[PDB]
RNA sequence: GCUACCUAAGAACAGCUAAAAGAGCACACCCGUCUAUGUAGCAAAAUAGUGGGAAGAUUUAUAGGUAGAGGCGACAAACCUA
RNA sequence: GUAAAUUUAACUGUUAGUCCAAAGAGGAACAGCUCUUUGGACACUAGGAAAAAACCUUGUAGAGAGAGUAAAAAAUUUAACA
RNA sequence: ACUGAACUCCUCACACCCAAUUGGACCAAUCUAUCACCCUAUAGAAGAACUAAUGUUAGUAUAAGUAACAUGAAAACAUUCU
RNA sequence: UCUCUUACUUUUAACCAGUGAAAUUGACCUGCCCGUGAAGAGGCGGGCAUAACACAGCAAGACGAGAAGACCCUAUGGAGCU
RNA sequence: ACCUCGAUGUUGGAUCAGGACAUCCCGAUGGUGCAGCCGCUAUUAAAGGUUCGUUUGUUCAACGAUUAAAGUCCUACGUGAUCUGAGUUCAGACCGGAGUAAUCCAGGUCGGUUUCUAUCUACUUUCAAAUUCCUCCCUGUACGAAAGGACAAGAGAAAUAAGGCCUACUUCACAAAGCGCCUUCCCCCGUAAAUGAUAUCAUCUCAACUUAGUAUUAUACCCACACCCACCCAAGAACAGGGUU
């Protein structure tokens, strides 16, 4: 199948500039509670999942340091310490991965 | 500008219970203030005449099921159950067509976070939760019934017949093959991508298709009538409905079910309740189950032929 | 072509003929060559007959630049303000004496098309028709099918 | 755009609206031709009869 | 036509859609918090609650034994799916596998997600939190709360 | 340097039945009977399935020779750089 | 009545044509069929028969917001009997 | 009785509506000789004029943001898994 | 294979992100019926229909596209063969 | 030989059919060399249907078993940008024949590439008001002389076509489907007859009029303007739609 006569630009603006193509204006951006980087509702603030994203790689930088190489995967539970920090009475028998670093304020 | 919103946007952790609890007592109490409607003021109740059509209900597939007869044949049913039925509004003769009055029939009840303003606004004056679906029916003025009236299943009777509509069963885009019922190509003799097509849609000289030619597109969900299903049973403490056959619509949906419009069935609703059977002034409770005289029943002495 | 050029309504530019005619141009900008074959036909004009053009209408300005230039022009503007040139190269004394006086006679109005040859400004005297002229009135304004 | 500035209706009744806008009832083109019980019966006294006949007829 | 077909087809095949999910699941029990696609993460969350299940039914048993031993492909993970998982989950019944949405991934711009077994040493999600106590709505709903209580 | 033919000196052909065999089934390999995909394709002739030969008139690497009024040809007027 | 004809010098171009009325020939007293003769039209403008080459009116060129004309619209409705 | 043309009249000016072919009057760009000096004149000359040859070259359109094209999963980005 | 097809998986396909062709194209503000016409009309006559714009299918039409028909004829155009 | 050789792809066949009636049947009427059943012919009627196989490539054609029927024709001898190439239109070869030969045959045979990604028009649920056969009673009656053998009325069963459904059967299983299940409602006009004139009888009336005679001025689906991030869905390509108490 072929071109019988080439489109003109006037049935080319009426096709590719219609309501059904142009890109939606979307409203469900407000700003975060903290840190004010305009998150979207329903979906996780980008600036804090990259706090978390950075802290978890790090503890789990100090936990692959300290289970020597792969299939070790210990059978208790393990909890982090900060500068400090003592290990409370309940974190006996659990494992303890410090770091160097204060606590942050909002990992409690 | 203004951002999109729903009801428990902003709400605390410890408000969502109180709200859903709240509401629900409430609409639960305006359901159970509309269980008198003889002695609040109802409209005055007219006998039968030979001319007249009275007003349908609005139920919800159930289920299918068997049911034999006591000559011992096997005839399907379907379970329609009859939810929360009330009379809406009352339009009158002169103001819809000029022809014959309409009377308005809500389906079962949904949300009212999930509506429209101007159908809040339109419940709130008439004293009802929400309602799922709104049917019209076309009756005359001797059976007008006050809006906001009780509909229960036993507004039909053992051995009548019924027609019932619903959205049939979608199947989105579909090809001609099942839809249209048309015969394919061969598979294997040489043919050559042509096994599900069409093939030819019009002659060679009208330089065009015509307008009714049947072609792919989407099919199914659309509304449609089954007309002449016989009533089998009437289950009066779950308010079910058991119609003959098979009825259109996939099963929880909603339909409409009114008296038949085919005319061997013409004049036989003289032994029907006719404003609609009510509740409070038969005097007399209703059993749990009412039978057709050829249908077996559950407890029987399991028939032997002689 | 006439959808493709702007049009005007025939109008005189001071309501001439009522008072007073008055001569619509004012000045006329001679430019000729000192030397040059193109402007042989100005040169003779303004020896010969532009004097006399000059005292036959007081009212038109005359100036003569003499003026090195290889197509010699005219330049005519009208008492409303239009400003009219157009080029005397290469003619004779009688094409540039005809198009000077045809320069003089006209009124500054553009040359485009004419609309409606005529400018009745009081175009009915014993009055326009509107629907009502010849339809006789009835006893009392009663419209057809009225009551009382 | 002409069809619509048209209203047409079945029988005597016109809307209020419709009457209360009417100017110049237009004169009918045919003219009705008048049935025989209408013919004010001085001209049927007026129209002469034409034909004498005979006294021994039934019809 | 899918009227009530659940089990969205993933992989080149119903094996390798069930191999995807089991490196998810493995990954899952290892790691303690993951990012995949959003398909994927939703019905690796559908089967590792019933993991949780089946580690639930105990140690001695060989069905279980044989389901672990199937479903995780590192075989370490098992003394951690009997001995720690499962007795920090002894109280609770089937709430657990967080699962929130994250925005994009940066490539090929696909929908992400960051599912989570709860206990979890990890630092916490910033979780999305319901509306505060004390705003102007709570508080007028507090009033209504008090005096309808109050009335009753 | 593809292809038709020839020359010099080389290389390859698992396993079973081996009747002795230009023997049989069947690998590697050579060829392309039928079907389907593809037709601006992976490909200016392919891919997948199904096929014939596969110890001999077999296949193939290297170098050389036969050239257009011709070369070559188990004659297809087949091939001689698409 | 008119103003054109003959000759002289110099060349190109047309020379594969259609329809209509009439006299014909072939064919079926068929064809938008073939071939001559006489005339007209087209391959030049405009108006008309519905759009239409060949049917009718009309030819020598423009502006005009004047006028008089040419050709120019299809009419028909019917079976008694001594 | 009327409507109804480029036919005719009316005011003005009048060479200004045919294929192939023929005759005649002008004319842009360029160089030269002589003039001219905000782009012109008189003569000679010619590679002297493009809405069209499936014309050549170069740019950009339509088809069209269409056909088609890719990267196995997790993660400490050490490794592990299919 | 069929009476008589159905369900499932993958490729394909639809939506989001990136890169990003080709044949074709006089201009198109691109409807239907009847009739007309170089004899088969979207562009003509008479009627009918008619707010604009995408997205996904179908192939009835555009005497659709790629090859200056390979069937037939002509050329005082070629060539093979006897 | 009037468009078409700077290409209108050719016969049948598969799918889809549209239309005309000069009607095969189902409907309704006249005549009959119509005693009944079958028949023949004429008028009206196109809403609906018009089978499965063998051989030859066949459209044609011959035969077997059925059915109320296996209708005629047109639609570019309908439809190849939907499909096949069975022969029919090349390059190889064989047989019979013509020709010294190269070559050929409206003679036969074995084999022989079917390319396109839809630009424009038109179209993509018109929501619904079905048809026919067969069985029982009548009846073994009407009818002959006997064979044979009816209409009309009533009752029951199916098949086709359309619209839907999953409770039993089956492919299969939190679904989709048939081999399964449920429903399907009004006519159609050619004539057969009263009274009665032109023409004091008679006469059905392109005389005024009266009956069969008109189904319909037919009823059921669908008809609430804006909460919309997000989630689910029996809804769905995207869009859109239903629920979130
Ligand atoms: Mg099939
Ligand atoms: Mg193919
Ligand atoms: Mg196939
Ligand atoms: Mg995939
Ligand atoms: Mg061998
Ligand atoms: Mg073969
Ligand atoms: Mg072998
Ligand atoms: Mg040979
Ligand atoms: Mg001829
Ligand atoms: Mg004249
Ligand atoms: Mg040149
Ligand atoms: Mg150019
Ligand atoms: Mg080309
Ligand atoms: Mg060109
Ligand atoms: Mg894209
Ligand atoms: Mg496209
Ligand atoms: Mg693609
Ligand atoms: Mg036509
Ligand atoms: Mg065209
Ligand atoms: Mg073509
Ligand atoms: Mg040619
Ligand atoms: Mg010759
Ligand atoms: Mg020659
Ligand atoms: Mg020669
Ligand atoms: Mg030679
Ligand atoms: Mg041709
Ligand atoms: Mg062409
Ligand atoms: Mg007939
Ligand atoms: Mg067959
Ligand atoms: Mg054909
Ligand atoms: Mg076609
Ligand atoms: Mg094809
Ligand atoms: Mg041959
Ligand atoms: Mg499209
Ligand atoms: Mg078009
Ligand atoms: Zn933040």
Redesign the pocket.
Known sequence: ????????????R???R?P??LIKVK??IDVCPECGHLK???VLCAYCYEKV?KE??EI??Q??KQ?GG?FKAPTIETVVLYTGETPSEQDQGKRIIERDRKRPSWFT | G?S?????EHLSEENVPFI?QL??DE?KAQLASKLCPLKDEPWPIHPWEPGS?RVGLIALKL????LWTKDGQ???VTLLQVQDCHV?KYTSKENCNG??A?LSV?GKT??????????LE??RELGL??????????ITDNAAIKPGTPLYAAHFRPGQYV?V?????????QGV??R???????????????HR?????????????????????????????????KVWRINTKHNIIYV??????????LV?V?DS????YKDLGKNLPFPTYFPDGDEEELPEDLYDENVCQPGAPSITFA | TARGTPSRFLASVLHNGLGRYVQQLQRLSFSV??????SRGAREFVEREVIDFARRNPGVVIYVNSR????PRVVAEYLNGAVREESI??KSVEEISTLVQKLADQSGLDVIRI???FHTDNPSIQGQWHPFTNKPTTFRGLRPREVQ | TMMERLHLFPDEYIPEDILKNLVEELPQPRKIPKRLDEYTQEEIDAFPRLWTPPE???? | ???????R??????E??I??L???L??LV??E?????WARV?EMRGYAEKLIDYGKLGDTNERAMRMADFWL??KDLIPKLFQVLAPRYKDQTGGYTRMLQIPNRS???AKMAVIEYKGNCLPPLPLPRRDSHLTLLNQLLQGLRQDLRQSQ
């Open positions: 199948a072929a071109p019988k006569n080439r489109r003109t630009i006037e049935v080319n009426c096709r590719r219609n059904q193509k409203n469900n979207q509702k329903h994203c978890t790689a789990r930088r936990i692959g289970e792969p | 203004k999109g919103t729903w009801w428990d859903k509401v629900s609409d059509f289920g299918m099921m068997p096997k005839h399907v809406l022809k014959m309409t809500g949904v949300s009212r976070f999930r509506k429209a303003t101007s159908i339109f419940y939760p929400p309602k799922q679906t709104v049917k019209i029916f076309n027609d509509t619903a959205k049939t069963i979608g199947k989105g885009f093959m099942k249209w019922g048309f015969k394919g190509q061969p598979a294997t003799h040489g043919q050559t991508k042509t097509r069409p093939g030819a849609v019009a002659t060679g000289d009208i330089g065009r298709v015509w307008p009714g030619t049947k072609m792919p597109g989407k099919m199914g969900n659309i509304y449609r009538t089954e007309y002449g299903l003959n056959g098979s009825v259109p619509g996939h099963k929880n949906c409409k009114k419009k085919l005319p061997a | 060559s000192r030397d040059g074959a193109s090195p230039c290889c197509v190269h290469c609309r409606k040859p | 021994d007829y039934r019809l | 036509i899918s009227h009530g077909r659940v089990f087809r993933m992989g080149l095949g119903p390798s859609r191999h995807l089991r490196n998810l493995t990954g290892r790691h918090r993951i990012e995949a696609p939703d492909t590192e490539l090929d711009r």
